[PDB]
From a paper:
Here, we report the structure and kinetic rate parameters for a glycoside hydrolase (GH) family 5 subfamily 4 enzyme (CelD) from Piromyces finnis, a modular, cellulosome-incorporated endoglucanase that possesses three GH5 domains followed by two C-terminal fungal dockerin domains (double dockerin). In this study, we characterized, at the structural and functional levels, the CelD enzyme from the anaerobic fungus Piromyces finnis. This fungal enzyme belongs to the glycoside hydrolase (GH) family 5 subfamily 4 of cellulases and acts strictly as an endo-β-1,4-glucanase (EC 3.2.1.4) with confirmed activity against carboxymethylcellulose (CMC), mixed linkage glucan (MLG), and xyloglucan. The CelD catalytic domain displays strong structural similarity to GH clan A, a group of 28 unique GH families exhibiting a (β/α)8–barrel fold in structure, with the highest sequence similarity to proteins from GH5 subfamily 4 (GH5_4), a family of enzymes that predominantly display endoglucanase activity (EC 3.2.1.4). Like other GH5 enzymes, CelD contains two invariant catalytic glutamate residues, the acid/base Glu154 and the nucleophile Glu278.
To facilitate bacterial protein expression and to study the contribution of fungal dockerins to enzyme catalytic activity, we characterized a single GH5 catalytic domain in isolation (ORX48147.1 residues 748–1105), as well as a GH5 with the native C-terminal double dockerin (ORX48147.1 residues 748–1192) and a GH5 with native C-terminal double dockerin and a non-native N-terminal dockerin domain. We present the crystal structure of a CelD GH5 catalytic domain in its apo wild-type form and complementary structure of an inactive E154A mutant in complex with cellotriose solved at a resolution of 2.5 Å and 1.8 Å, respectively (for convenience, in this work, we used 1–362 numbering for the catalytic domain which corresponds to 91–452 residue numbering of the “1–536” in Supplemental Table S1). The crystals of the apo form and the complex belonged to orthorhombic P212121 space group and contained two domain molecules per asymmetric unit. Almost all amino acid residues of the CelD catalytic domain, with the exception of a few side chains and three C-terminal residues, were traceable in the final electron density map. Structural features that differentiated the P. finnis catalytic domain from other GH5 enzymes were longer loops around the substrate binding site (between βI/α1, βIV/α4, α5/βVI, and βVIII/α8) and possessing only one disulfide bridge instead of four present in GH5’s from other fungi. The overall root mean square deviation (RMSD) between apo wild form and inactive E154A-ligand complex protein models was 0.26 Å for 359/362 Cα pairs, demonstrating high overall similarity and illustrating that substrate binding results in little to no conformational change. We did not observe substantial conformational changes between the apo-enzyme structure and the mutant structure with the bound ligand.
Numbering used by the authors: -1 to 360
Write the structure that this text describes.
Amino acid sequence: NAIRDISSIELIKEMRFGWNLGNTLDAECTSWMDYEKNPIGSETCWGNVKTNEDIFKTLMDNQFNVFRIPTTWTGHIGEAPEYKINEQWMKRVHEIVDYPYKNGAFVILNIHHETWNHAFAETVDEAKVELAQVWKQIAEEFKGYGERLIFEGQNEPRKNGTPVEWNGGDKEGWDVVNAMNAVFLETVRSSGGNNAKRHLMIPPYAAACNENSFKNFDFPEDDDKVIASVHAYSPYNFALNNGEGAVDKFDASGKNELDWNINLMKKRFVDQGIPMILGEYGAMNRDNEEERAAWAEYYMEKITALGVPQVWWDNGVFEGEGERFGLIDRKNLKIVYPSIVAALQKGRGLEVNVLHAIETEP
């Protein structure tokens, strides 16, 4: 029940690097799964195994101490306007949050792939109501948790389906996102318990590392416990491109693009005293572990000099046509790419010591 009363800038210093529990509690399968009969079945409906504590303990052995829990509440929410969250779902989310928390790590709980938080001015009034009701129950469920539990108001709020979805945003989307962020901050701060001193993360438009999203991002000026949430899979062709133009080498043009976006984070947040966390990043598997290792160490070295931690996005996908950001085999508790983890440790300034590494095939 104890909570330290320290600023986000001071609390961020205790962070090394992070890991995402992707394609798990954020998996959304309402188009074919009966959420009434399977109230917690969505956790594994995208191919990941049921979450256990040993997954996080395997990662903490490799010096991970930040764990982001992407959670989708669509399908687990009752009818409007009360928006009652399913009790069995809230309990399972509580159990998974306890896995890294009860072992002493930082935890980030967010609202992820929602159908109702689209950044369209047509439905903001009801979207703000649902956002407030949902975060009221979440803040209530985790009242007595300390400063190591961090709430992230939104994931990538955007105008889905528009050409404006992934280009940075327009004036309409920027105002809706700012209004939604304000509702989230007020709802948590107004609740009781430790929530008045809990650290809160808010994203710009779509959490994009873009000038248009950075320029039109309202940030509170009198709350030292609010953090900016940015996602940056940079450079795009090497890290995120899953189609045409995808490259497997980390070339000089890729370094220039990455250096440009890291400088955008410095000018927007670091120089202006805005605490910021790279909540999502990573490089897709292209049979290029040593290319991704050098990229990861360079990326980690740069933002470590800025005091910004990063959180790897791990969806548990290794092969196939999907986005292959897998890093740990959750069923066998093994690090599939040990040199990538070693690069994170070396770039962060830690002693290189990779445990539970996968064997060598040759």
